[PDB]
Amino acid sequence: MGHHHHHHSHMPDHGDWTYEEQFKQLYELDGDPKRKEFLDDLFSFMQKRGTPVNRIPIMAKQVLDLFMLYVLVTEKGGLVEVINKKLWREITKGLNLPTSITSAAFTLRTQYMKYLYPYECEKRGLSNPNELQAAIDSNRREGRR
């Protein structure tokens, strides 16, 4: 498995390639009706409020499965809840990601917040942007004395 020595960068992941392809891999993940519906409805929704998908973040050379990420986080109670539980270890493992990665919990927490958030608050009302900041700051204080 290997311990997290030093992240910074590696050989180009599949998300640093500038090509005019609509990220079809997300749809080709499952091939299920719910899969394409959520993804497309999401992209339109986030675009309307001025925050669409430019390029998708990569983890361990695989795509950050937006659909799967949203599923695991929402069933735990939403972004802020997951932050308050610090239980991101479950979120990574749910995407077949190695919890050994240095800032995995923080990286997912960032990318999710950017792309996957207005949907949980609008459709469900799970987390508010206000409680969110308090959650994050509480996570920040966990580092030094």
UniProtKB/Swiss-Prot annotation:
Changing Y119A: Abolishes DNA-binding. Widely expressed, with highest expression in skeletal muscle, thalamus, and colon. It is found in: Nucleus; Cytoplasm. Induction: By p53/TP53 following DNA damage. It comes from the Eukaryota. Homodimer. Heterodimer with ARID3B. Interacts with E2F1. Interacts with GTF2I and BTK. This is AT-rich interactive domain-containing protein 3A. The chain holds residues 218 to 351 of 593 of the full protein.
